[PDB]
Amino acid sequence: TKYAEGTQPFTVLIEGNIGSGKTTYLNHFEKYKNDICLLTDPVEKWRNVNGVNLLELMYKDPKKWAMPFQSYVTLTMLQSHTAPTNKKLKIMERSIFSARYCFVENMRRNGSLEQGMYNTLEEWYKFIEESIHVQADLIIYLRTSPEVAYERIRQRARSEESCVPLKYLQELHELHEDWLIHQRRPQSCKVLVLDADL
């Protein structure tokens, strides 16, 4: 009796650090557009919310903007998770799970999110889990070293990501490990590990 329950096909989630090549990997499935539902680069939504760049505001002023930004990230993931499709396969760049277990968690650790903000978000995640169906059958984890991840972010040269230190990517990498390999976080899904260092 959850929202979008029984309306979703086999769902594959593409995960990995910033600049791990999530979009590049999903760009290979481009020939089967009419066969597979492909939702790539949700970051473009976050860079342009009716003209407002939430990603830029988050990086410039985390103490003020990390909360509304993560809230919006959660929303867009949800809208993608529950989007209607007549296709037999759906591949998604990112998910609600990485937003929660990797990014929200690290922003709690580094002090970008105050306790009250972290708690508000966590209580939202718990309610979403009982109200909204999130289809997750397989997660492909594009495993990279923080050094290679940093290389790709530099080459793409998003103005918002120009101040991102290697320390930040090292933290996120370890959280990706905790969630997808070390199972320190609650998630019941099949994970395929890939060496994404080309």
Ligand X SMILES: Cc1cn([C@H]2C[C@H](O)[C@@H](COP(=O)(O)OP(=O)(O)OP(=O)(O)O)O2)c(=O)[nH]c1=O
Angstrom distances, CA of residue 51 to CA of 48, 60, 130, 178: 5, 17, 33, 36
Report the 10 Å Cβ neighbour count for 120: 15
b/e burial code for range 24-59 (CB count within 10 A of at least 16 → b):
ebbeebeeeeeebbbbbebbebbeeeeeeebbbbbb
Binding mask of the shown chain, residues 10 to 39, with x at each position contacting Mg ion by CB under 5 A = ------------xx----------------
Angle at 102 between CA 101 and CA 105, to 5 degrees: 70
Q: Rounded to 5 degrees, what are φ and ψ at 17? A: -60, 170
CA atoms within a 13 Å half-sphere pointing along the CA-CB vector of 39: 25
In the list a copy of itself, ligand X, Mg ion, none, the entry touching 138 (Cβ below 5 to 8 angstroms by class) is none
- Minimum CB–partner distance for residue 176 and Mg ion (Å): 15
- Minimum CB–partner distance for residue 79 and a copy of itself (Å): 6
> For this structure, is 93 an active site residue?
yes
In the list Mg ion, ligand X, a copy of itself, none, the entry touching 98 (Cβ below 5 to 8 angstroms by class) is ligand X
- Minimum CB–partner distance for residue 49 and a copy of itself (Å): 5
- Residues forming contacts to a copy of itself in the complex (CB under 8 A) are 1-5, 7, 49-50, 52, 54, 57, 63-65, 67-69, 71-72, 75, 78-79, 82, 115-117, 119-120, 123-124, 127, 131-132
Question: Does 146 interact with ligand X (rule: CB under 6 A)?
Answer: no
Question: Does 134 interact with ligand X (rule: CB under 6 A)?
Answer: no
Q: Report the catalytic residues.
A: 93
